[PDB]
């Protein structure tokens, strides 16, 4: 096969992507060992769905797991009557998701389970895949002539040939694994054929962060979670929290081998110690550095010029309300809260008006990083930690370090009941989620 493993692609045909996918325990070869994972479509990651605006998607999910499950179309601004976070598909049963891809949309999105209380073990076990919305912008020469790849960043731990079970500490921190994989492969080699690469990046891990840096190179950010930036942004490194996506251009500077690494990053995970009167919580500190892949540049690389512009960001109406959502923790109980409450599916927490804009101020009063996700309604991050964001683009996850306030501009789109929650999925399962009703 190709030196660089990527999930198989399923494309819409004549404007329709019609597909049956099973969620099933699947024996496979992974990082060199045989293991049984939970997969969609018999692979890890699941197949990449590639569509265009205005396509119809008709996806029939057959539940072949011993527990109920469902799908969240992460990042898609569609109706919460389709992307229904409350729906349960019992074992053995099927459900068909049908929706039209919005006209003004582009980027890398993904699908995974969202049945409250069961997300973390199901996601950790291998249930996820990417969805790419192709754009007319992809035809500009600066992108068309680039070599494009998807990088699904997901870690795993195995025990007795199966995903390792969650411990109590995993429920508190969010579970990380020792196998730090790209597209389900252990440190693959990407032998580039072109001097410019276009990489779509997805953090599909439960809890692991990726402080991305390519040796000797900057990255040029061209898209965030839910759409293009207005113009490329040069960065030295790029942190992707759980649930986030980004697209970058890489302009290979000279021949050679360059490591793409996940540099050390401290997200505030905790351990326990006993020093003589102790048993108390103590910071785990920064993650150990990981090599994600080996990037081999071609002979005499001459990268394309960068695009001068990408997509203009919409001019939003003035907002009609300001919300404050405060995140807190009870680490030893592994309980997590928004405005002092845990999720209750029967309780509506916020009620807003469709087609108005709101300002959401999300404050992390905990000590751990928490990546805040809102379904259905992509947002523009104005500032985090009091620092203005250096670009305009649609996002649907925003990372908050301890103490930080994020200020978001949130246009409300589809009517109905949906959710917002931490995307360290253990924290969501353990209560850090609330309900928004849009009418």
Task: Indicate the annotated binding residues for Cu(2+).
Answer: 72, 74, 112, 114, 280, 370, 373, 375, 421-423, 427
- Asked if 422 touches Cu ion (CB under 5 A), the answer is yes
**For residues 7 and 43, what is the distance between their CA atoms, to the nearest angstrom?**
8
Q: How far apart are CA 248 and CA 239, in angstroms?
A: 12
**320 interacts with, out of Cu ion, a copy of itself, none, CB within 5 to 8 A per kind:** a copy of itself
Asked if residues 409 and 322 have their Cβ atoms less than 8 Å apart, the reply is no
The region of 18-26, 104-112, 118-126, 320-328 touching a copy of itself under the rule CB under 8 A is: 320-328
- Pick one of a copy of itself, Cu ion, none as the site partner of residue 243 (Cβ within 5 to 8 A by kind): Cu ion
State the nearest-atom distance from the C-beta of 191 to a copy of itself, in Å.
55
Q: How many Å apart are CA 91 and CA 85, to the nearest integer?
A: 17
Stretch that binds Cu ion, among 44-52, 165-173, 313-321, 417-425 (CB under 5 A): 417-425
Which of 33, 322, 341, 355 forms a contact with a copy of itself (CB under 8 A)? 322
Among 282, 320, 333, 348, binds a copy of itself (CB under 8 A): 320
Q: Which stretch binds Cu ion (CB under 5 A): 70-78, 187-195, 219-227, 402-410?
A: 70-78
- By beta-carbon proximity to a copy of itself, the closer residue of 259 and 321 is 321
Cβ contact 215:77 at 8 Å: no
Contact flag: residue 321 with a copy of itself (CB under 8 A): yes
CB under 5 to 8 A by kind: which of a copy of itself, Cu ion, none does 149 bind? Answer: none
Site map 93..122 versus Cu ion, x via CB under 5 A: ---------------------x--------
DSSP states of 50-99 as a string?
Answer: EE-TT-EEEEEEEE-SSS-B--EEET----TTTS-TT--B-TT-EEEEEE
Q: Is residue 208 part of the contact set for Cu ion (CB under 5 A)? A: no
* Closest listed residue to residue 110, CA positions, set 131, 87, 95: 131
Taking CB under 8 A as the rule, does residue 355 contact a copy of itself?
no
Most distant CA atoms of the chain, gap in Å: 69
* Number of other CB atoms surrounding residue 95 within 10 Å: 17
* 243 contributes a contact to Cu ion by CB under 5 A: yes
Alpha helix (H) ranges present in 128-184?
Answer: 141-144, 168-173
Out of 125, 295, 424, 438, point to the residue binding Cu ion (CB under 5 A): 424
Interatomic CA distance for residues 265 and 211, integer angstroms: 6
What is the rounded CA–CA span in Å between residue 100 and residue 53? 8
Per CB under 8 A, residues contacting a copy of itself are 320-322
């Amino acid at each position: 096969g190709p030196s660089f493993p990527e999930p198989k692609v399923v494309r819409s045909q004549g404007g329709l992507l019609s597909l049956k996918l099973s969620a099933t325990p699947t024996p496979l070869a992974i990082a060199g060992q045989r293991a049984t994972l939970l997969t969609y479509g018999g692979s890890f990651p699941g197949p990449t769905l590639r569509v265009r605006p205005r396509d119809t998607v008709r996806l029939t999910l057959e539940n072949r797991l011993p527990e109920p499950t469902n799908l969240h179309w992460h990042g898609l601004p569609i109706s919460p009557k389709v992307d229904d976070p409350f729906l349960e598909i019992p074992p053995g049963e099927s459900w068909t998701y049908e929706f039209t891809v919005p006209k003004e949309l582009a980027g890398t999105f993904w699908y995974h389970p969202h049945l409250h209380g069961r997300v973390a073990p199901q996601l950790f076990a291998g249930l996820l895949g990417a969805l790419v919305v192709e754009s007319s912008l992809d035809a500009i020469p600066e992108l068309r002539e680039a070599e494009e790849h998807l990088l699904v960043l997901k870690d795993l731990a195995l025990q007795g040939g199966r995903p390792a079970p969650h411990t109590p500490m995993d429920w508190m921190n969010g579970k990380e694994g020792d196998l730090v994989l790209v597209n389900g492969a252990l440190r693959p080699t990407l032998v580039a054929q072109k001097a410019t690469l276009r990489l779509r990046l997805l953090n599909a891990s439960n809890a692991r962060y990726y402080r991305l840096a390519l040796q000797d190179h900057p990255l040029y950010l061209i898209a965030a979670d839910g759409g293009f930036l207005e113009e490329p942004l040069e960065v030295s490194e790029l942190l992707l929290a759980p649930g986030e996506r980004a697209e970058v251009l890489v302009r290979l500077r000279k021949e050679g081998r360059f490591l793409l690494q996940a540099l050390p990053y401290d997200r505030g995970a905790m351990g326990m110690m006993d020093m003589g009167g102790m048993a108390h919580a103590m910071p785990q500190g920064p993650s150990r550095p990981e090599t994600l892949l080996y990037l081999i540049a071609p002979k005499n690389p001459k990268p394309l010029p960068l695009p001068k512009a990408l997509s203009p960001f919409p001019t939003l109406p003035a907002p009609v309300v300001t919300r404050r959502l405060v995140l807190t923790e009870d680490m030893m109980a592994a309980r997590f809260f928004i405005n002092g409450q845990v999720f209750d599916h029967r309780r509506v927490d916020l009620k807003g008006q469709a087609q108005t804009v709101e300002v959401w101020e999300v404050e992390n009063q905990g000590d751990m990083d928490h990546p805040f996700h809102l379904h259905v309604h992509p947002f523009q991050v104005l500032s985090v930690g009091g620092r203005p964001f250096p670009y305009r683009a649609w996002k649907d996850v925003v990372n908050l370090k301890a103490g930080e306030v994020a200020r978001l501009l949130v246009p409300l789109r589809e009517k109905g009941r949906t959710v917002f929650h931490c995307h360290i999925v253990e924290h969501e399962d353990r209560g850090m989620m609330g309900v928004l009703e849009v009418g």
